[PDB]
Design a protein around this ligand. Structure first.
Ligand SMILES: Nc1nc2c(ncn2[C@@H]2O[C@H](COP(=O)(O)OP(=O)(O)OP(=O)(O)O)[C@@H](O)[C@H]2O)c(=O)[nH]1
Ligand SMILES: Nc1nc2c(ncn2[C@@H]2O[C@H](COP(=O)(O)OP(=O)(O)OP(=O)(O)O)[C@@H](O)[C@H]2O)c(=O)[nH]1
Ligand SMILES: Nc1nc2c(ncn2[C@@H]2O[C@H](COP(=O)(O)OP(=O)(O)OP(=O)(O)O)[C@@H](O)[C@H]2O)c(=O)[nH]1
Ligand SMILES: [Mg+2]
Ligand SMILES: [Mg+2]
Ligand SMILES: [Mg+2]
Lengths: 161, 62, 67, 162, 161
């Protein structure tokens, strides 16, 4: 089976770290992504083409041009970045409300759970506006991208849906 | 006079629409090709792995 | 004759739409160029892998002949 | 203090009566399965919660519907250590909230028994109770341990705030 | 050594035939190209990324979107098509005068030399208006695509220039 995945989220959320943890099995050093990364990740009989697009503020208008053919959205959130959770909420809802994204299933990685000050998924359910999403298929997965904790659990959810 | 402001914006509007349509076609072709190439690369990497393992098994037997 | 308020609405409509269109033309140009670069990179990487497969398959043949 | 009628439902053994008396008495009590109902009033943050705890054993679940009318908040309690019955809990939850007489009730889910090893977390509860399918309702999943009281007042806070 | 090559020309000129004769070693069946093809051809320790873009009139306005990073232009001409040799001249000078194409080396494939009354290189040179251009590196190379005649001599010139 084949699935085109678009992975979005604010800068520094951990998108590229997740991609290469999955692809290579290791935590690689990264810098803010200009343009995109794309890798084929195979797991539980599904070949995921994962598009990782830079999330710095001024390049977010580029996101919508990668929507075409997306079957699953992965939205990555830095759960320790309290000051930007509302910004992440706004970006998430802008994505899922786009016509080209209306049918995508939604995986949210509640990332950086290793940090002592990281918010738990239950703390994020209204701050990210998730409970008010209507008529969609969404799931929140706590993760630590550097250790790989939670990543395969998120991929399993995608395969099951 | 007042009609002139509107006509000139409209002309500009039509050129922008034209180039956006063209860019979208090219961009979509390009995305499809990237997705295809990444899959092809993955298949080739797997093929290479299988043949490299088949070399070692032939060297072991030999 | 056309009302000034209508002409104003249409002027405002077109300013907004043309501004939006210019932004997306700029955005699409950037994305297209990033995609072209990746296509070139992937095509090259694919070719390296094809060349590697052909090199190993040749060795695979000679080892079958030596067997 | 504003009054709020609360209906607390969930499968047998989920922890409803434990919660009720933890809140009412401020102490952990031993329970037996509930045939019929318990009702207690608890005041918190200037709201007077009138909480109806109705027995959850399978054969008495049809009686739940006698309590729907007038209900302003549903507390649905889930035993998160009971993975074998999570699908049954999902079925019951959607049955309750789809009833015409429950259409205006806000929904607090207690993801209870978080103290137990391998207990399902709130994010897992979200998936297994099919919460993504809920339409036009106000809902929230609160982790809890009714034996210690952890999470219970956070749950009441959500109700007060909504 | 890497070179990005853009291969343009009117429809039916032989672009896709040339690309896959070079890549796959044989003349394959082709239909008019919607979109583009791209392959890496290695010859003389130099690795050519050759972009073959559909030349139907409908889609020629799209060519300019493929200029970015072009180091060499290959312009293919059907030498038996006298009715369109001037149309080809117009399209060529359009291309080479674009900002993104002004530093590009120019290789002309005077293609379909096998056919009865087909134009020779020096005639193609004149008809394409190249003669008086002293500011650009250009060459006209006779070719038969379906047999591979002239094709590797073309690449030799690109390597030389
Ligand atoms: N502590 C901790 N750090 C993480 C985790 N995941 C990613 N990081 C770090 O967060 C920083 C940003 O990670 P990236 O993967 O580059 O973020 P990004 O989402 O790709 O950012 P953009 O490229 O700007 O879109 C890096 O220093 C990572 O090592 C995590 O789970 N825990
Ligand atoms: N370990 C643990 N046990 C709990 C927790 N909450 C309740 N229990 C226990 O679970 C058992 C069932 O609790 P009850 O309150 O009687 O369950 P109920 O929902 O009222 O069940 P019914 O009366 O049949 O509807 C009791 O033994 C409680 O002590 C908890 O958070 N952790
Ligand atoms: N006789 C002869 N036929 C050729 C030669 N090169 C290509 N052809 C034929 O010309 C026809 C068109 O060739 P294509 O390669 O499809 O032309 P193209 O330039 O790719 O055309 P577009 O895809 O529309 O841009 C095909 O039937 C080819 O077999 C040649 O050198 N000699
Ligand atoms: Mg990145
Ligand atoms: Mg009870
Ligand atoms: Mg072609």
């Amino acid at each position: 089976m084949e699935m085109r995945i678009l992975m979005l989220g604010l800068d520094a959320a951990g998108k590229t770290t997740i991609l290469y943890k999955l692809k290579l099995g290791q935590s690689v050093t990264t810098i803010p992504t200009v343009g995109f990364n794309v890798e084929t990740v195979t797991y539980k009989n599904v070949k995921f083409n994962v598009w990782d697009v830079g999330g710095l503020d001024k390049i977010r208008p580029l996101w919508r041009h990668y929507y075409t053919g997306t079957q699953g959205l992965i939205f990555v959130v830095d759960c320790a970045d309290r000051d930007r959770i509302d910004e992440a909420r706004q970006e998430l809802h802008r994505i899922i409300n786009d016509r080209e994204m209306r049918d995508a299933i939604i995986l949210i990685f509640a990332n950086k759970q290793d940090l002592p000050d990281a918010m738990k998924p239950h703390e994020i359910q209204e701050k990210l506006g998730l409970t008010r999403i209507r008529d969609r298929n969404w799931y929140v997965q706590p993760s630590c991208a550097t250790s790989g904790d939670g990543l395969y659990e998120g991929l399993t959810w995608l395969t099951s849906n | 006079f007042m009609g002139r402001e509107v006509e000139n914006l409209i002309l500009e509007n039509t050129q922008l629409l034209e180039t956006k349509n063209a860019l979208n076609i090219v961009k979509n072709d390009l995305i499809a090709k990237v997705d295809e190439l990444t899959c092809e690369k993955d298949v080739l990497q797997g093929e290479l792995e299988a043949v490299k393992q088949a070399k070692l098994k032939l060297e072991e037997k030999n």
